[PDB]
Design a protein around this ligand. Structure first.
Ligand SMILES: [Zn+2]
Ligand SMILES: [Zn+2]
Length: 67
DNA sequence: CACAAGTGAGGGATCA
DNA sequence: GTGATCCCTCACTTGT
């Protein structure tokens, strides 16, 4: 099973389908300090661990890897 | 501005 | 549709 966007093959349609969901680029998780939007909750909780290290943290919006 | 190295966000996996 | 986790990537970032 492959995708018409990347051509990346997937051994199961269950995880190919969650890959096509990554194409719409839904960023529903936002940091309540620097306003940066995230695709996963785990990406947000890992991000605050660095907000405790440094005081002045503000990254630029990074690009998603697949369109 | 190339270049290396350190950085952290994106995205793949199994599973409840 | 979640999401949690383990982890490897790779674009930014920094320094030379
Ligand atoms: Zn795809
Ligand atoms: Zn933040």
């Amino acid at each position: 099973h492959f995708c018409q966007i990347c051509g990346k093959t997937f051994k199961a349609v269950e995880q190919l389908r969650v890959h096509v969901r990554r194409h719409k680029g839904v960023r529903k998780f936002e940091c309540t300090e620097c306003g940066y939007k995230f695709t996963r909750q785990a990406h947000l909780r890992r991000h605050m661990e660095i907000h405790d290290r440094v005081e002045n943290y503000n990254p630029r919006q990074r690009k998603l890897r697949n369109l």
